[PDB]
Structure formats: C-alpha cells, structure tokens
Write a protein that binds this DNA or RNA. Structure first.
Ligand SMILES: [Mn+2]
Length: 745
DNA sequence: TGAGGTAGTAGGTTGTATAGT
DNA sequence: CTATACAACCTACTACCTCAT
C-alpha cells in the first residue's frame, strides 16, 4: 500500500510574537462606517509608505513597523493609537498575514535570467510567476510567437497555530496572459471583433465583449462628454496616457458591451481574455504545446511548488523562518486521516461483473418491459454514413454483432429494440434554420411508430450552420420521447472504422439508450452500512438573482434509480421552503413504498449547496415518522488536491482513496493517470447523522461507480451528480411529477 | 451532442472560522 | 446576542485527451 498527503509545507522555525503598531480609521468623508473602507485604507496606507505591511483586525488596523499616520486621504483618516506585542495564541489571522507578507517580500527580490523578475507580487495570497516550470525542471518562460503568455498562479495561504509553528499551504495553478492589447491587435490588422476582453485599467467585473470599433480617434472628445485622455487624467490614471506617442493618439476607439450599457474605452487599455477558445483560434500550436503544462500531475505540481518554496528561502525578519521543501509524509501529522476505499462489486443480469465493460457479455440489470422502436433524424447530405451508423448501433443493441461479426464480448438482445430497416422511420433534414429543426422533430413525432429517437447532429465545433442538438432535446423533452443524438463525426467513426474505435463509442451509445428508456445497467451488489434508500438533492443559481429549485433523486440500497422528483412550487431565493422538503420526502417515502412494499428505515441524504440551516425540519420530519437518517454534504469542487507517496515520490492518487478529519472528508473518485493531470477530489462532510464516515464515503464511492450512462465512472456520486444534472436541465423535466427515464444522460 | 475526466477563462454567493462586546 | 471578511463554494463556457476486456 501507499500513503496520502495534502499539498502542504511545514515551517522550519517558529514565529516569535512580534511588536506591532495599533492604528485606527475614522470615516472622514462619506463612508461613515469603518468596515466599508478598512480594506481600501489598508491598501492606501500600504501604498503610500513603500509597500510596508499593513494589517486589519475586525474594526482596527495594524502595521508591523512604526509608520507615520496621515490625514490627507479623502475617504478616511488614520491615526496612530498604540503599540503592543500581539499574543500569538490569541492571534492566528494577523500572524498569518505576517507570514504571507514576508513570503511576498522575500519573493519580490527574486529575479530569473538576470534581469527578469520571476514573480509578480501584489502582497496577497496570489503570486503569479512569470516563469513556468517544465517537466525537465527548467525555469523557462512560455510565450507564443503571437504574444500569449502562460504563467503560474501560485497561492500561499499559511496558517500559524497558537504555539508558533507555521504550516504553508500551497496550490499551483496556471494562468493565461498576453502582452498585446486591442491596440496592437489592431495595429497588426487582426479582426478583433467578437472577442472577450478584459479592461486592464478599470477593474470592473463583467463579461466585456467587443461590439464594433469606431473609426474616430481616441484623442477626440466623444459621446462620453470629453476626450478619453481627459477621462483618464480625471481618474488619477493619467500616467498611463502620459506615455502616449503620436501613433498612440492615432488609435481608434473600440466600444464594448458589458450587458448593462456600452462603454467607450481606448484600445490601448483593453486586452483579450485568453480562453482556450482564443488559444485554439489564434495559435493552435501554442495550445497543444501548453496542454502538457496546464494539466499537471501531482509530481509536477510538487516540482512546481518545490521551486516556489526554494525561492522563499529563509526569511530573516521572522526568526529565520524557513519552509520545508517536501510534503508531509502523512497527514496524520496535519490533522487528517487517510485510507483507501475498496471498490464496489457491481452486478447486471447475471451477478458480479469484473469490469464495467463486461456487461454487454453479461446483460443489463433491469430493462424496461416492452419493445423500444427506434426512429432516426440525420442530415440530408449524410445519408449513407447515417445508415451505416444506425445499422451499427442497432446490430449492437439487437443482434449483438459488431459490424456483422458476432463475438463473445457482446450478448444478443440486450435492449429489446424494434427497428425494421426497410419499414421503420427515417427522416432527413437539411442543416438550416431553427424552425426547420423544430418541424423536423415534430415530423418524427407525428408518425407514432417511434419509442426512441436516435438523431444525427453536426459536430459541436465547425461553427457554421448551427448545431441541431438543443432544439431537438427541447422538443424531445417536451414530447416525452427519449433521444440519443449522435454527432456526424461519431457517425463517420461508425461508418468508416475497421477497429474498436467505434466499439467504445458504441458501448457508451447503448448505455445511453438503456438509461434513457428507463433501464439501469448495473447496481452495487452490497452497499456498505445499514441503508435502505439514498436521496440526492441539489439546487442551482445561474447568475445574480436566478435560482434553480431543488430537484431530488431516489435510489435503493442497490443504487438503482427508483425515481427522480421535481417539486411543484418554485422557491424564493436560494433557500427552498419547507413545503418543498415536505413534498419531496413524502414522495420518496411513497416511491420506495411503491417499489418495495415497505418504508425506508435508513435514508442517507446526499446533498450539495445546502446549508446546515433547515436541519430542524429534517429532525422534525424523521422523528415524527421515526426513520433514522443521515445527511452527507457532498461538495462538488474543492480546491484541495491530494498527492501520494511511495518512499517520498509523488504520484497521482488512485481512485477511491480518501483523507478524513472528524466529519469532513476529501476523496479522489476518478482515476487519472499522469500526462492527463491530477485528480480533483470530492469534499464530503456530514451535516447530521450517526454512521461512520468510512461507510459514508463507501456509499459515496460506490455511487460514483454506478454511472448509468457511460463506461467510466462519474466523479460525483450518482445521487448528487444526477441531482445536479436534473437541476441543470430544469426545463426538460416536467413540472412537479416523477419520472424514471434518465433523459439527461 | 459517445462518454467521462482534467484544466483554463469568466462571474456570482455565503457558510463557517473568528475577532470583539 | 450581532457585524464582518474571505476561502470555499457554486455557476456557465470552451479546449484536449483517451476510451483496451
Ligand atoms: Mn448523452
């Protein structure tokens, strides 16, 4: 076996309790309260005084050296009060920002290649390094020929306990930048339209996109009311337009939309948001090159953070505070407790299966009773490829033969499909306007000889005449007909290939068409613990003020999806009511009653995005029905990463291993080998319950292995994962009542 | 949209650790 | 009993990669 760790660095030495300088902030201008301007006063007195450390405790303010207080600042004025040695046992945050400050000050003087500053530092948690690492440990810049800049984005967040020892938690993630602007991209005549841009000067938040580019110069007064150079002289920003030459005044104005107004900002300020769309459409060699550097296995992340901490060195302002360069050998020393979860034994038609691929020889666990008649849309210039495709997937579904040749890997009749090729419904459709796609799906649902659509769509790329996917899924969800839709590229894989590169695709096709007609391929053989049903819940929030109400999902102790339940009344705000929880848990009790002739006695409630609020309702509802129950909060995206160790060597962790402290657990559920990155684990915390977190996490991981619409396991559990996929597809579900056919899959 | 994973970019909210009072 | 900030959380979108029983 092996051991697990978190990306953490011990501190050699200890912070001895330093002498600070208390300060005070009075709301001289309009901001009467001290809370709304304590951050801005912190940065202002940090900036006016040679970037010396300035700290904040809840209403007060601090420094670390005696700094002359000032009164000229218009929003607030600062006055010295006193100077004390702050006790380390009662101050964790402020010695945290001490150690964070001295990491920033020790790194600001580190230069690479002689002249070039290796790090960009604004005295915070975020430390951008201009220099990446490579796999061969070369501190090398990474630039394009065009002017794109990959960079690291290190993140210190040290904590220091009551005694004095400090633990430096790190996480390297990379960063995309470019030196060029909208200015330079106009000067080399690139069509800058439709780009996502970032205002480098004004720090407004909002997805700024380019509408047009006005032919008027940026030195001429506009509809804003003045010249734009006057606009930046009047924002205390005129040192940016002071550098402007004649040709900089020969730039022309680029208007921009922020979904609330249009601005008029000069192209020298703006800069395109380098997404992978932009790297792909503008220099694909750079994008394919840096994909090895973006995705980082834990060994290369440890090498990157080793370079970072060796560039900390030793801080002589904090009693020679050094940080170690290796991780902890065990997170027992940090607080966590590690282990690996044994994988669940899964079963289909005939018992235990060795892999999830073997089910096509074995056979599916449940099939919905009846025959399921196909029906196919396909593009009008893509006819023979589509007929070969549906021939392939229908031979794999019905006949058990893969491009004609029957094999031992696939058993026959695994879906009870009914597709007579000379008799059943095909419709062709020309790739055109949206109402053609709507009437095309309507035309396939006129002829009522279809029980499962298998449409063919153009590819997600090739942004000429658009994807037929979304209008088809909207229509086939409104009209209650499940539809597994295929790309033309996958159809051409089915037509053209003489290899298994259509077989793996075809496995996932048939698992999709099984789950969408209401059959479930695999279940667990035995779910550990004493449990009778699982109830996933989740909610959503699209943007500001938009909220998705809570759609549930109901399993059994095998993990087969009994039901999923949209509730009736929409919520108010983020917090769903008590009536929603009332009808959801009434209907899980009804549904488990209907499936099994009895009530659940143990209901494990996985959930995401719920607070510890409204636990009192859960106590109420399952005391009054005396059903003991658990609530396990499964957090989808945690920033913690987990490494592994075989005698000091860092690798990715295998799937199933966890780290656990009390009732918060992190667990890697997905197996990601090197050259594809590090696994991004699951944060799992028990809100209320009485089961140990070993069986709680075992139910979690066993529900990750039962993704019923692919062959490789979903990272999330199928409770929280399928609950969230129902919450995203909030329209495709009918309002308020149950279904079993996994449309989202 | 074969499928799932990583990762970027961007933008919101807010539960819980944490100071006084 | 109450007022924070802020590391975590969530959301949306792509691109890249590999699927071996
Ligand atoms: Mn699908």
């Amino acid at each position: 076996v092996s051991n697990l760790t978190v990306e953490a660095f011990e501190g050699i030495g200890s912070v001895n309790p330093m002498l600070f300088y208390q300060y005070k902030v009075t709301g001289k201008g309009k901001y009467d309260n001290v809370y709304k301007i304590i951050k801005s006063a912190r940065y202002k007195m940090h900036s006016k005084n040679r970037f010396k450390p300035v700290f904040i405790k809840d209403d007060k303010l601090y420094t670390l050296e005696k700094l002359p207080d000032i009164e000229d600042l218009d929003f607030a004025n600062i006055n010295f009060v006193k100077s004390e040695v702050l006790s380390i046992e009662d101050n964790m945050s402020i010695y945290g920002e001490v150690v964070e400050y001295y990491i920033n000050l020790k790194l600001k003087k580190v230069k690479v290649l002689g002249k070039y500053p290796k790090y960009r530092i604004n005295y915070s948690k975020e430390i951008l390094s201009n220099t990446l690492l490579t796999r061969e440990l070369k501190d090398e810049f990474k630039k394009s020929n065009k002017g794109f800049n990959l960079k690291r984005k290190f993140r210190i967040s040290p904590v220091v306990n009551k005694m004095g020892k400090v633990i430096l938690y790190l996480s390297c993630s990379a960063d995309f930048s470019t030196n060029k602007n909208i200015y330079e991209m106009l000067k080399e005549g690139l069509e800058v339209e439709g780009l996502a841009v970032k205002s480098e000067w004004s720090n407004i938040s909002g997805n700024l996109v380019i509408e047009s580019v006005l032919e008027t110069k940026i030195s001429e007064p506009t509809s804003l009311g003045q010249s734009l150079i006057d606009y930046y002289k009047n924002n205390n920003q005129g040192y940016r337009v002071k550098d402007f030459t004649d040709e900089d005044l020969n730039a022309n104005i680029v208007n921009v939309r922020g979904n609330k107004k249009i601005y008029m900002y000069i192209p020298h300020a703006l800069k395109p948001i380098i997404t992978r769309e932009y790297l792909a459409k503008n220099d694909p060699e750079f994008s394919k090159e840096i994909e090895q550097l973006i995705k980082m296995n834990m060994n290369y992340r440890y090498e990157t953070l080793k370079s970072f901490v060796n560039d900390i060195g030793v801080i002589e302002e904090l009693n020679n505070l050094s940080f170690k360069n290796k991780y902890y050998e065990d997170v027992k020393l940090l607080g966590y407790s590690s282990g690996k979860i044994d994988e669940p034994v899964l079963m289909g038609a005939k018992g235990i299966i060795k892999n999830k691929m073997q089910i096509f020889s074995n056979g599916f666990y449940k099939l919905p009773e009846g025959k399921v008649r196909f029906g196919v849309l396909y593009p009008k210039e893509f006819d023979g490829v589509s007929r070969k495709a549906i021939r392939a997937i229908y031979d794999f579904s019905k006949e058990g033969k893969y491009h004609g040749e029957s094999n031992k890997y696939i058993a026959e009749h695994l879906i009870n499909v009914e597709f007579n090729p000379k008799e059943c419904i095909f419709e062709g459709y020309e790739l055109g306007d949206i109402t053609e796609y709507k009437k095309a799906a309507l035309k396939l649902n006129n002829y009522n000889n279809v029980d499962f659509v298998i449409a063919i769509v153009p590819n997600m790329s090739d942004e000429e005449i658009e994807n037929s996917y979304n209008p088809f899924k909207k229509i086939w969800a409104e009209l209650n007909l499940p539809s597994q839709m295929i790309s033309v590229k996958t159809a051409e894989i089915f037509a053209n290939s003489r290899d298994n590169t259509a077989l793996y695709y075809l496995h996932n096709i048939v698992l999709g068409i099984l789950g969408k007609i209401g059959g479930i391929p695999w279940v667990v053989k035995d779910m550990k613990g004493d449990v009778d049903c699982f109830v996933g819940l989740d909610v959503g929030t699209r943007e500001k003020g938009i909220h998705y109400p809570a759609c549930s999902v109901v399993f059994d102790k095998y993990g087969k999806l009994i039901n999923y339940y949209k509730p009736n009344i929409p919520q108010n705000g983020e917090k769903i009511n008590t009536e929603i929880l009332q009808e959801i848990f009434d209907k899980v009790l009804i549904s488990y009653e209907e499936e099994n002739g009895a009530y659940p006695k143990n209901i494990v409630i996985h959930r995401a995005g719920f607070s510890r609020e409204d636990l009192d309702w859960y106590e109420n509802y399952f005391g009054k029905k005396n059903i003991k129950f658990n609530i396990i909060e499964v957090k989808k995206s945690t920033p913690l990463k987990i490494a592994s160790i075989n005698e000091g060597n860092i690798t990715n962790p295998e799937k199933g291993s966890y780290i656990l402290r009390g009732n918060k657990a992190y667990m890697v559920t997905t197996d990601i080998k090197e050259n594809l990155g590090s696994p991004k684990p699951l944060k799992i915390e028990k809100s209320y319950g009485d089961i140990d977190m070993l069986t709680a996490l075992s139910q979690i991981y066993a529900l990750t292995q039962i993704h019923v619409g692919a062959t490789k396991s979903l990272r999330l559990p199928i409770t929280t994962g399928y609950a969230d996929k129902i919450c995203k597809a909030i329209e495709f579900i009918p309002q308020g009542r149950v279904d079993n056919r996994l449309f989202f899959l």
